[PDB]
Design a binder for this molecule. Structure first.
Ligand SMILES: *[C@@H]1O[C@H](CO[C@@H]2O[C@@H](C)[C@@H](O)[C@@H](O)[C@@H]2O)[C@@H](O[C@@H]2O[C@H](CO)[C@@H](O[C@@H]3O[C@H](CO[C@H]4O[C@H](CO)[C@@H](O)[C@H](O)[C@@H]4O[C@@H]4O[C@H](CO)[C@@H](O)[C@H](O)[C@H]4NC(C)=O)[C@@H](O)[C@H](O)[C@@H]3O)[C@H](O)[C@H]2NC(C)=O)[C@H](O)[C@H]1NC(C)=O
Ligand SMILES: *[C@@H]1O[C@H](CO)[C@@H](O)[C@H](O)[C@H]1NC(C)=O
Ligand SMILES: *[C@@H]1O[C@H](CO)[C@@H](O)[C@H](O)[C@H]1NC(C)=O
Ligand SMILES: *[C@@H]1O[C@H](CO)[C@@H](O)[C@H](O)[C@H]1NC(C)=O
Ligand SMILES: *[C@@H]1O[C@H](CO)[C@@H](O)[C@H](O)[C@H]1NC(C)=O
Ligand SMILES: *[C@@H]1O[C@H](CO)[C@@H](O)[C@H](O)[C@H]1NC(C)=O
Lengths: 264, 221, 75, 221, 221
């Protein structure tokens, strides 16, 4: 219902200095656009239209951005920030669960001592002469505002801009939409681990590990989401649920346990 | 010259905000010479472009069954908005205009009384929970079953039945594995209807709901 | 009631169940105090498949009482 | 220089079909010399005619306030549709735009638990029921209280509070006359959230909830 | 034009001895050409030079922000001595005076009750206690959780919420392992408030709190 394209921004930091450039990759996986993308860049009461004959828009101008592919609505807006401050908190545009998030914060051609990262306006971690904050496995526990502060040489301690880390799920929580939860004994019922992938992770292959009450049905994981059983007896009528995961098995979501009953 | 039929949105499609009510406008008996049909929809007499149309399907009677469907925002149908399904065809010299809105009438709140199973089916391998839903009007009502916040799909619901006082009543039987009932799980009958407080009511139940937990007398040899 | 039939109830039309069979319901409205007198009631089933083509189940105040003081024996 | 504050619909109205939700953009610091503002409303960038606008409001600080209301059916907002309020003022060097949409986050099922009053408030004349609601996301939740199918109005609800898990929890308190609690009265906590099945869960609580006093009599022969 | 703000001490630190109560006079929008800001710290009518001013800090928007933390002692604050900071900036031709003090109102003693976790919760891994604090005034409470003299850090507390009585109320939830709770540990909810007798109350809560009695009476004969 939402054919909205998306901008993929490289380098992944949404805020950069005045001396750099960033690439705006208007990616529409379905509804592919090799060219003819209307970049509706608005900064201050603007509607600057800069159409390009490719999918990439390398710019260096701050402001709100969005792309318009052929036959598709306008992209979800992305707020760039090209600032010439003294310390800037570099954050990824969008953080998904299980992503290896590195909240770097770097000065403007300076060495910053005693970098201290803040989350929700209180101390999170201390960095001795370090400009990198590392989150191994980002989850819902990691949200809210972030801003690192560090001492300059002798001018002033400086606090960076505030970024909002908002963890989004890579895919909707699975639901075990079996073909018929009341199959007469000896009939095939096709279990479906229904899951709508978030479009930002669309090239991701999904692994659907179906389950009985506690026994792993089938053989481990599989790419296909249709665990077509052949004949169901009164013995194997228990709770059924499926697990969905990405390639490294880092993000694992469990579908709610729906009961399957065999009619006789 | 074609003819215009009409099916109102089903109770489920209008009751839960999760779903979306699709008012459908069945049209049959379309001439072969003029199969292109134009459909107009009115929101109190205002055109709306969002309404789509199923492709015409010729039946075994060599007539094209064209059907028009419009998404309806739930509060609009609930307050009683009037939707005019217009059929345009050059075979008919005039555009047929027909009207549908909410079936007016005073609503009566659905009393809900879920009943635990009797003791003598406990020996049977499948228990049968029950959710009497009585004293409501109209029959624009759906019943769903829940357990730990998840829907149950082994339930059946008898159609609404006219009652002595002119209201309706209906039942719903859930079949569960006897052990699931034995481990004291919670099953809740959720019933949604216009006359309810939030158009939703979830009367719950568990194993031995009725029994007051005071003292159990045991006598052993 | 008490061996003689009465007519205040209603009965839902039979509905197909999951295993291909049917099931239906019968709601008998009684006066609340009349039920509180402990009167015995029975629902009757006249079906072709029954042995004897008849079956009676009786329930009453005590029969469906919550029975907080369950006297459950142990072997 | 005028300012614009855009307020999303309250979480109560976005989940019940009984309530019509709306998003309001205000324009403050409006001088006496510009009593006109033209409001263009975008639904995913598309113009909409249904935006009712309230009259101008006089302010204590020699300015004005113009508010504008757009009625939106809940399926749009719960799908994350953005909204833009366009302000057309002569004092503006250019029109200002503001985007509001439901916050994107992984839904979390709010496990609703009801805690009965302690032994201590029974000396008081008014007990206080409790409806803990832990572990949900986002903080778009409405908690209402009802007894015997009828609403209660003597309740308050703390704003959602971020937990260690990162999912907001929330508390609700029903001040009720102790006599009603001492009799058999069922007070049910009604909760509403995006993540819950059918956007609703109703947890009952009354005097007999979880009294595990069990005189476990065991006669031996 | 720079602006200043005065922040009263946290209610945790103004009622507690081991922690220190601080009053912070913050300034913002201090542009670089006039960055030197000096502080005039009056406790009631007399300047004090115990006030420690942190070094001037630069924000992202290239505006300075300087805080001035004055450490007070608790008798002065609870007696409501009108603290004020007079910030001298070169932009405004005269320094700006901001005065704050304790919330002046009739104190009302909190009536703290504690509630055990619901029996439904007793299946989850982590149970969660509850410490309702009712009917206090003003809205300055520190709530801490203790087990056996060591404080617990797995708790979060809701902000004070205005009640219908005109007082406030605030819940506080502590999550503990079910193993710790089931074995029968004791958890006391310490609440410190100015209207309390000796500014302290502890309500003990343990596994057998919600059980009136338990008679596993046999008769082995
Ligand atoms: C230039 O930037 C500065 C710095 O602002 C910070 O950085 C920028 C990039 C943005 O992200 C800001 O949001 C961020 O704060 C701006 O200075 C800000 O100015 C505004 C408006 O003038 C002030 O708001 C007013 O402040 C108080 C309430 O402040 C409390 O709550 C805020 C929550 O937003 C906190 O940021 C404040 O620190 C403060 O919270 C209290 O702080 C004290 C001291 O540490 C603690 O002891 C307390 O415990 C704590 N309490 C809580 C509940 O957290 C009020 O008068 C009024 O309602 C406004 O909100 C900001 O406070 C101020 N920020 C700072 C850090 O001082 C400038 O405005 C920017 N310049 C321009 C031209 O816009
Ligand atoms: C750095 O931080 C440490 C630890 O808080 C502190 O002792 C030290 O003075 C700081 N040094 C500088 C240069 O800011
Ligand atoms: C017997 O009654 C007690 C107390 O009401 C209850 O806890 C117990 O479950 C009952 N026994 C059965 C088998 O349900
Ligand atoms: C009595 O109640 C206890 C506790 O619920 C239960 O374990 C026991 O089996 C019961 N005894 C009988 C005879 O039902
Ligand atoms: C109650 O008594 C019965 C019979 O002696 C025994 O089996 C059971 O364990 C007891 N239950 C409790 C909770 O004491
Ligand atoms: C209760 O007493 C019975 C003896 O009748 C014993 O078997 C049972 O274990 C006891 N239960 C508890 C919880 O102490």
């Amino acid at each position: 219902r939402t054919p909205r394209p998306i901008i993929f921004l490289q380098p992944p930091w949404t805020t950069v200095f005045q001396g750099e450039r960033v690439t705006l990759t208007c990616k529409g996986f379905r509804f592919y656009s090799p060219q003819k993308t209307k970049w509706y860049h608005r900064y201050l009461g603007k509607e600057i239209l800069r159409e390009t004959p490719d999918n990439i828009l390398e710019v260096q101008e701050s402001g709100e951005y969005r792309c318009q592919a052929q036959g598709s609505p306008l992209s979800s807006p992305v707020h760039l920030d090209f600032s010439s401050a003294s310390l800037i908190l570099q954050a990824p545009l969008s953080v998904f669960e299980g992503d290896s998030v590195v909240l770097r914060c770097r000065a403007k051609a300076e060495v910053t001592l005693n970098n201290t990262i803040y989350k929700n306006d209180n101390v999170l971690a201390f960095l001795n002469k370090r400009t990198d904050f590392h989150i191994p496995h980002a989850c819902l526990k990691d949200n809210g505002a972030y801003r690192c502060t560090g001492y300059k040489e002798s001018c002033c301690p400086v606090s960076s801009n505030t970024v909002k880390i908002q963890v989004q799920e890579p895919f909707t929580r699975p639901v075990l939409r079996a073909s018929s939860f009341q199959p007469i004994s000896g009939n095939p019922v096709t279990l479906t681990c229904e899951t709508q992938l978030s479009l930002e992770r669309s090239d991701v292959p999904l692994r659907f590990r179906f389950f009985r009450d506690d026994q792993t049905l089938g053989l481990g994981w599989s790419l296909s989401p249709n665990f077509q059983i052949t004949a169901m007896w009164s013995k194997d009528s228990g709770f059924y649920w499926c697990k969905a995961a990405t390639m490294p098995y880092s993000v694992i979501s469990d579908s709610p346990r729906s009961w399957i009953q065999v009619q006789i | 010259g074609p003819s215009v039929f009409l099916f109102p949105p089903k109770p489920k499609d209008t009751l839960m905000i999760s779903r979306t009510p699709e008012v459908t406008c069945v049209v049959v008996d379309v001439s072969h010479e003029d199969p292109e049909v134009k459909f107009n929809w009115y929101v109190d007499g205002v055109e709306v472009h969002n309404a789509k149309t199923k492709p015409r399907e010729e039946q075994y009677n060599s007539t094209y069954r064209v059907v028009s469907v419009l998404t309806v925002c739930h509060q609009d149908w609930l307050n009683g908005k009037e939707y005019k399904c217009k059929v345009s065809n050059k075979a008919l010299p005039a555009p047929i205009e027909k009207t549908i809105s909410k079936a007016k009438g005073q609503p009566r709140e659905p009393q809900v009384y879920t009943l635990p199973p009797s003791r003598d089916e406990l020996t049977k391998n499948q228990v049968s929970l029950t959710c009497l839903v009585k004293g409501f009007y109209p029959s624009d009502i759906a019943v769903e079953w829940e357990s730990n916040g998840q829907p149950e799909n082994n339930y059946k619901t008898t159609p609404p039945v006219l009652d002595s006082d002119g209201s309706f009543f209906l039942y719903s039987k859930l079949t569960v594995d006897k052990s699931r009932w034995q481990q004291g799980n919670v099953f809740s009958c959720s019933v949604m209807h216009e006359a309810l407080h939030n158009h939703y009511t979830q009367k719950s139940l568990d194993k031995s709901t009725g029994k007051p937990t005071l003292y159990n007398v045991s006598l052993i040899m």
